[PDB]
Amino acid sequence: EYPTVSEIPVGEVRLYQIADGVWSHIATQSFDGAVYPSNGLIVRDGDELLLIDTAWGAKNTAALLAEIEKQIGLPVTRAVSTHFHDDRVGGVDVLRAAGVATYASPSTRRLAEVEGNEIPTHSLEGLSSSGDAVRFGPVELFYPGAAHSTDNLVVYVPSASVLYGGCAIYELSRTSAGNVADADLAEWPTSIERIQQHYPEAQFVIPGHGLPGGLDLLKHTTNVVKAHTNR
Ligand SMILES: *[C@@]1([N]S(=O)(=O)C2=[C][C]=[C][C]=[C]2)=[C][C]=[C]N=C1C([O])=O
Ligand SMILES: [Zn+2]
Numbered sequence: 001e002y003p004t005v006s007e008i009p010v011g012e013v014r015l016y017q018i019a020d021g022v023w024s025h026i027a028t029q030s031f032d033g034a035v036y037p038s039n040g041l042i043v044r045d046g047d048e049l050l051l052i053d054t055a056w057g058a059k060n061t062a063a064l065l066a067e068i069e070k071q072i073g074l075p076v077t078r079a080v081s082t083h084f085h086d087d088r089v090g091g092v093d094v095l096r097a098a099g100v101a102t103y104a105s106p107s108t109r110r111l112a113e114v115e116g117n118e119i120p121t122h123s124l125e126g127l128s129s130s131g132d133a134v135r136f137g138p139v140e141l142f143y144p145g146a147a148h149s150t151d152n153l154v155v156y157v158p159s160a161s162v163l164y165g166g167c168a169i170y171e172l173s174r175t176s177a178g179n180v181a182d183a184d185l186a187e188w189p190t191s192i193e194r195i196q197q198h199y200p201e202a203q204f205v206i207p208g209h210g211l212p213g214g215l216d217l218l219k220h221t222t223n224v225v226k227a228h229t230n231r
C-alpha cells in the first residue's frame with residue numbers, strides 16, 4: 001500500500017494519506033545510476049495546506065502541486081524546508097512562483113546560501129538551540145540538534161501523532177549511512193534521544209526516504225549511525 005520507487009516514474013509524485021488531514025508526498029530522483037524515493041509531508045490547516053519539504057527538484061515540485069490540486073484541491077499557503085539540501089529546498093522557486101510562502105530556520109537559509117541552493121524566503125525564529133520547539137499552525141517544529149545536518153528539523157502533527165523525521169531518520173531497509181558529508185556523526189545519537197524524549201507518544205514515524213514505521217526507526221537510525229561511526 002505505501003508507494004515505492006517502482007510505482008513512481010521519475011518526474012511524478014504520489015500522495016499517501018496517513019491520517020485525517022495528514023499525507024506524505026513521495027517522489028523519486030536518479031543519482032549515480034540508482035533511483036531513490038523521497039518523502040515530504042502535507043498537513044491540513046483549516047481550509048489551507050502546509051507543505052513540509054519540496055519533492056526534490058523543480059519538475060517534481062511542479063508535479064507535486066499539480067497532484068495536490070488534483071487530489072486534495074486546497075491551496076498550499078505555506079511550506080517549511082527541514083534542512084538546506086536539494087531534496088528539501090530544490091523546488092522552492094516553483095513554490096514561490098505559485099504563491100506559496102516558503103519558510104526555513106536562519107541556520108537552513110545561511111547554509112543553502114553558502115551551498116548555492118534555493119533559499120526559502122521567510123525565517124523561522126526560535127529554533128537555534130538543541131531541543132527548541134515552536135508551533136507552526138497544525139504542527140510543532142523541533143530542532144533536536146545536529147544529526148544528518150547541523151540545521152535539521154523534525155515535524156510533529158499533534159492531532160494525528162505523526163512524527164516526520166526527515167533525513168535525520170532512516171527507514172528500516174537502510175542499513176548503511178547515506179549522505180553524511182554534512183552530518184554531525186558525534187551528535188546524531190544525542191539528537192535522536194531528544195526526539196525520543198519529546199515525542200514518546202508518536203504512532204507514525206516517516207523517514208526522509210522510504211517506508212514509514214513507528215518509533216523503532218529512531219533506534220534503528222541510532223544503530224546505523226553508530227556502526228558507521230565505528231567503520
Ligand atoms: C542521500 N543519501 S545518499 O546519497 O547517500 C543515497 C543515495 C542512494 C541511496 C541511498 C542513499 C542522498 C540524497 C538525498 N538524501 C540523502 C540522505 O538523506 O541520506
Ligand atoms: Zn540532506
Ligand SMILES: [Zn+2]
Nearest residue numbers: 087167208209
Ligand atoms: Zn535526504
Ligand SMILES: [Zn+2]
Nearest residue numbers: 172219220223
Ligand atoms: Zn534496525
